[PDB]
Amino acid sequence: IFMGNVVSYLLFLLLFSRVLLVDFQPAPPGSLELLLYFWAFTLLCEELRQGLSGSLSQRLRLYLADSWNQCDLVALTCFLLGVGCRLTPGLYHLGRTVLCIDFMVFTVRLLHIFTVNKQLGPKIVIVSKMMKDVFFFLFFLGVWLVAYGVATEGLLRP
Amino acid sequence: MFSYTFGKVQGNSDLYWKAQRYRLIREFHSRPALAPPFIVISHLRLLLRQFRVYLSKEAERKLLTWESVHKENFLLARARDKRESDSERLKRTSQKVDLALKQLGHIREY
Amino acid sequence: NDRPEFVRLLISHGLSLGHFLTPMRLAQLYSAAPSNSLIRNLLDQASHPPDVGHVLRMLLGKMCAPGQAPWSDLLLWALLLNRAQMAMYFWEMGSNAVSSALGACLLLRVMARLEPDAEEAARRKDLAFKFEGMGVDLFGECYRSSEVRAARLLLRRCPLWGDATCLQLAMQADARAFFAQDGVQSLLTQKWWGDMASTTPIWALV
Amino acid sequence: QSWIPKIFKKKTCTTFIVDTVWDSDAHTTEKPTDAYGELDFTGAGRKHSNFLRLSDRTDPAAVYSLVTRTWGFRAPNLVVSVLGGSGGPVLQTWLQDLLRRGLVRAAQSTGAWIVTGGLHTGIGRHVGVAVRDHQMASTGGTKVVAMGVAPWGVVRNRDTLINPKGSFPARYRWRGDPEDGVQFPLDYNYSAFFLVDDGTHGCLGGENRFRLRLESYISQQKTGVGGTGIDIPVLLLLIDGDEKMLTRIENATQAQLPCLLVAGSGGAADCLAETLEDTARDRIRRFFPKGDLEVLQAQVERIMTRKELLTVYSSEDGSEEFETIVLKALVKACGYLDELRLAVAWNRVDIAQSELFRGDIQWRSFHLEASLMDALLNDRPEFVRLLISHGLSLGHFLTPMRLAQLYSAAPSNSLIRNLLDQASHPPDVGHVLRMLLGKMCAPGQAPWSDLLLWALLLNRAQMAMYFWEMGSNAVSSALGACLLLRVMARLEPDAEEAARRKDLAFKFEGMGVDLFGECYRSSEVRAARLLLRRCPLWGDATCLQLAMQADARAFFAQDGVQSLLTQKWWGDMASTTPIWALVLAFFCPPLIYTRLITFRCLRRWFHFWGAPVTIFMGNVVSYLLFLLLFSRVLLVDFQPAPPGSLELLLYFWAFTLLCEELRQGLSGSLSQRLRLYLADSWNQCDLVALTCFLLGVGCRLTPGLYHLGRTVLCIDFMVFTVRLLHIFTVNKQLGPKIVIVSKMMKDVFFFLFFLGVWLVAYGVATEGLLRPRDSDFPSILRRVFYRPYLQIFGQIPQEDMDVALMEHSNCSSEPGFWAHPPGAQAGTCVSQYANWLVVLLLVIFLLVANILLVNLLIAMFSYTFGKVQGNSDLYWKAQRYRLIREFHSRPALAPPFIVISHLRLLLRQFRVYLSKEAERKLLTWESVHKENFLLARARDKRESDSERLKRTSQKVDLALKQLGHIREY
Ligand SMILES: Nc1ncnc2c1ncn2[C@@H]1O[C@H](COP(=O)(O)OP(=O)(O)OP(=O)(O)O)[C@@H](O)[C@H]1O
C-alpha cells in the first residue's frame, strides 16, 4: 500500500506539473485540469477520512495541532484558493502564482511520506533539529547584511 | 554547529523514529488498498457501510504460565547477581565479623 | 503503614491472599491515602466504598482502564498511592507481567501530569521508568526464549487493561525504550511486510 | 492430559459388608479415573501442583513416566522418603533444625526428591514447614521437589478434584474447615500429589504398598543422560514412629532400601538405633507400652537380620553433615556405586575432592574412568578437570565404544544429532567434519583433539576450553575451533544457539590471539614458523588459511601477523627497503646488484622480480600505460577507417587483460566458482568494463555504428580508469580510506533524495512563474533540473530569470507584460507578473541547497567517518592477507606480455616445511608458552579483589564455625 501510494503521489505531481506548465491557460479548464481537480478532491477526501478516524471538537483540535497536517491543510487550501482565483475571469495570474507555490507545498510532502521509510526516517527527523543553528546563521547574516549593504550604498551614492 | 548538533541528537532521533515506526505502520495498515484517484471507489464503500491475536482459554493460560516462568527466572537471576556483587559480599563479611566479635566476647567473659 | 519488607515476609510465610483481601479491607487501604495526595483528590471528585473504577476510567480513558489472590487490585492500589516498592512486589507476584508493566508505566506517566508537586511528579516518572525497564527486560527474556510466543504475548489483548495490546499501551505511555528493542522492531517489520516474508527484496517487490 | 483416564484407574466399592472381611481387591471395581490434573490452592498465590488419583494396584512405571515426562519433573539424583512423625504440632527444635538445615538443604543441593505424606498433618506438615522455612531464607537457588503419597479417602474437600474431562485448574479448598482427626487437607508445600485410592473412606495405611513399590522402582532407574549412570539412590529417613513404622522399615529393608534412623526421636527410631548399637524386651516394653512382645520381638529380629541396611543419625552429627551420612548409608548398602560416582550424579565437586584427597582408600583406574565417563556424559567440566588432574590415563580411557557413547549423548533436537543422522544414510564424525569444513580443513595416546572436536560439535564451552588447554597445536586448534563454531552457527535453527556458538568462537579467537601474542613476543622467527606451518589436524591448513576461512579479523589485526604479512609482501627483499629504492631498481635492473636493495645473478634476478611488491609495481605501471594507450587511441587514432596498429595493440592488450581475468576466475565446481565470481562487486565492474569494450569494438567495426562505438568506448574508459582504486586497495596508505569511502553512500543518497525533492519543487515553481514561450520538453526539463542544479555550483543566470535585468518587449500575444531573456536556452520571452517571487525563490533555493543541505552532508560525513574508522581499519587488515596472496599467485610478467606466461600455463595443463624433530621442538615451545599464559591468567584471576573478598568470606565462615565449636563447650 505504501509503494502504491508513493507511485500515485509521484504521478499526481507529474500531472500537476504537466497542467501547470502546459495545460494552464485563461481558457476554461481542459480534461487534464479537471482530472487534477478530481485527484485533489480524492486527496482531500482521504485527509478528511484520516482526520475523522483519528468528540468532534477534540479530534479537530488534535488534527490542527499536528505540524504536518497543518502543512497538508495549507496545501489543499492553497489549491482551492488558486483554482477559485483562476476560474474567476479577473484573477488568472494570481491563481497561477498561488498554484505554483502550492506545487512546492505538495512536493515537500514526499519527506513526510518517506518518514516511515527505514533509511530516510532518522535523518529526516534529525533535519528538524538543525533549525536553531539555521536561525542563528540567519540572524547573524541579516545583521551583517544590513550593516555592509547600507554602508556600501551610502558610500557609492547611486 | 551542524556537526555538533548532529552528534548530539543522533541517538535521541533514532529512538524517536523507532518509537513512531509502530504508529506509521498502523496508519498504513488502516488505509484503503487502493491509491488515489481510485480511492474514491473504496471511499464510496466506506460511505455506504455507515496487529492482534485471539487465543483460546487453554492457549492463553499456557502463554501466561510461560511468561510467568520467564519472569521468575529473570527475577532469580537478578537476585543472584545482586547477592554475588562485591558490595553485598563485603556487607555479609562485616556482619559475620560482628557475629565473630560477639562470640569472642562471650568466650572472653569466662 | 507502607512496610514492603513486612508484606514480602508475611506473604512468603504461608498466607491466603484471596481470603485476606475483603472489600472492607480494600476500602480501608484506599482510605489510607494522605488528604493532600492526588489520589485522595481524585477519589473525592469521583464520589460526587471508594470509586477506584471511576478514577481509572477518568485517568486512562476507556479500553485501557482496569476468592483468588488479587495481585492486580493490590498493584493498582500501590500505583495510585505511588508506593514504589510495594508496587514492584505486587508486579513481581502478578501474572500479566509485560502488559501490567506497560500499564503501570502509562498510569504513572498520566498521573505525573496531574501532580501539583514537581517532586511527586518526578517520583511518579522515576517509577514509570523503572516499570518500563522491567517490561523491556522481561520481553527481552521472553523473545530470546521464543519469538512466536513473544509476538503472541505482544499482540494479545489484556482484559486487565481494557483489552489493549502491549503495543497500544506502549504507544499511549510513550515508552520509547520498549519500542526500541530488537524483538519489537522485528515484529513491526514482520507486520509491515504483511503476509509476505520480511526478507523479501525490494526489487522483487517492485 | 486426555489419555490419563485410559491408563490410570480408580477403585469404587461394590460389595457391602457391615462394620465377612472386606477385601480391598475383591470387593472393588476399577474404572477410568476422574480426578487428575493440576491444583490451585484457592486464595494462595502459589504455583499449581500436579495431582493424580490412582488405583492402589497401579504399576510404578506408569506414574513415574507421567511425573518425569508429562508433568515435566527432572529425574531425581536421590530420593529421601521421610517416615514416622510423633503426634503433636510441635516438634523438637533440634529435629526441626535437622529437617530444615539438613534434609531440605541437602535435597536442594543434590537435586533430590523429598517423598512423604502430602497431607497437612504429622511428618508431612513438619517437612512442609521445613521446606517453607528453607525457601523463606533462601538464595536464588532451584526449588525443592516434594512428593506426597497420600490415601484417597482421608483427603479433605477432595470432591472439588473430581472432573472426568480433566480438572486442570482444579480449585482446592485447603483451609477454613474445623480440624478433624479423620480427614486432612493437602499441604501446598508439595510439588506433586499421588492420591492412592484403595476404595476405602477415612482409613489410613492403604497407600503404603504403592509408596514402597514406587520407591523400589525408582531405586532401579539410572541417573544422567540415558541409562548410563548409577542406580538412583533411595534412602528412608525415620523419625519417631510406631509398630506400623516398624512394619514399614521391615518391608523397606526386605526391598533392599537403606534406612537412616534419627537417634533421640522416640519410639521405633530410638528402639532400632539402640538395638543396632547394642549388637532386649525391656526396650520394647518401654518404647511400646500395650504392645504384644512376641510379634514385636520377632519383627525386630527380622529387622536386625539385614543390619547393613540400617544407619544411625547420631545426636552428635550436625545438619551440615547430612549428605556425608547419606553417602555412608548408600555405599555400605552397596557392599554398584562408589563415592565418586555418587558425587558426579549429584553436582557436588567438594565431595569428589574430599574423596580423592583421602589417603586411607586408593582409587583404582576403573573407579576414575567410570566417574570421568559420568562427568563427560553429564556435562560436568569441573569434575573432568579434577579427575584428570588426579592421575588417570586418557589414552586408555577413551575407547571407540566410549567415544560412540559420548557422541550418542547429544540431544535429539541438537544440530549435531541432525548432522549425524544425515551422515548415517559408530558415529560418522569424520563425514560431518568433511561436510562442515569442506576438505583440507576438516580433521593409545591421550586423545585431546578427539575430545576437543566432540565438545565443539556438541557446543560445550567449558569442556571445549579445557580440552584446548590440554592439547598441543594450540594456535591452529583455536583458529579451527573458531572456524567450526562459526560454520555451525549458520546451520543453527535457534538464534540463541547460534549466538552461543558465535560467543564461543569469539572466545577461541581471543585465546588464539593471546597465545600468538605471547609466542611472538618470545620469538618472531618461531612464531612465523608456527603461523606458516601446516597442521595435519586441520587438513594441512596453515593458521592464515584458518583465520581467513573463519573471518577472524582480530587475529589478522595483531602486530605480529601484520609484520609477517609485510615480510611476505616484500618477498626475498628486506621489509625496510625504501619505496624510492624499489622504483630505482625497477627502472634500472642492474641496480638490484648494488647496495640499494638488501636481499635476505639469476637467483637474485628471480628474487627481485618475483616479490609480490615488484609484481604489484609492474602491474601498476602496465595498467597506467594501458590507460595511456587507451586515451591515445580514443582521442587521436579512432577514425571510421579500419583500425590501425595502435588500435590493434589496444585490442591485444584488452584480450590479455580478459585472459588474466579468466585465469583469476578459474583459479579462485564450475557453477559455484562462476557464482562466486559474479557475486563480487569489483569483478562485476571489471566484467562490465570488458563487456563494454567488446560492445564498443563490435559497434565500431560495423560500418553503421561508429559513433555509438565511440560513445561506448568513452564511457568504458571511465570504467577502466576507476579500477585504479581497486588496484591500490592493497596499498597500505590508500586502503583503509578507500574502504571508508564506500560507507558514505547512505549519506550521499540522503543528500540526493533531499536535493531531488527540492529541485523538483523549486524548478517547477520557477518554470511555472516565468512561463517561457520556448516550452519544448527538453527545454522544460533543462530549466527545471539542470539550471537549478548548476546554481548550486555558482552558476546563477540572473539575466535569464530576473526581469529587471531584461529588456521589456511585446513578444507575446497573450495579455500581460513580457520580457526577453538573452539566454540561448531560456524561453526567449517570459512573464513579469510576479518576478519578485522568482527572485525570492532563488534566494530561498540558495539558502536551502548551497548552505543547509551541503553543510548537513558535511556533518553526516564527519559523523560516519568517526563512526566507521576502526571497523574499516580492521576490515582492511583482515583483507590484506588475501590481497598479498592474490598478488603472490599471479605471473611475474605484466600485460600485454602476460600472454607469454599464459601460454606456459596452457601448455602445462606462504608455507614452511619442518622435519619431525623441528616440528616437535616448535610444538613443545608453543606448549610452554601456552602453559605460561594460562598460569599468568590464573594468577591474575586469583589476585583480583573479587576473589580475595570471596576467600575472605569463606575463611570468616570457617572462623565462625570454629568459634561456634568453642562456644558449645
Ligand atoms: N493445607 C495447608 N497446607 C499448607 N499450609 C497450610 C495449610 N493450611 C494452612 N496452612 C498454613 O498454616 C499457617 C497457619 O494456618 P493454620 O492451618 O494454623 O490455621 P488457618 O486455618 O489458616 O486459620 P484459623 O485458625 O483462623 O482457622 C498459615 O501459614 C497457612 O498458610
Ligand SMILES: Nc1ncnc2c1ncn2[C@@H]1O[C@H](COP(=O)(O)OP(=O)(O)OP(=O)(O)O)[C@@H](O)[C@H]1O
Ligand atoms: N607408575 C605410576 N606412576 C604414577 N602414578 C601411577 C602409576 N601407576 C598408576 N598410577 C596412578 O595410580 C592411581 C591408581 O592406579 P593404580 O596403580 O592403583 O591401578 P591401575 O593399574 O591404574 O588400575 P587397575 O586396578 O584397574 O589395574 C591412578 O591415579 C594412576 O594414574
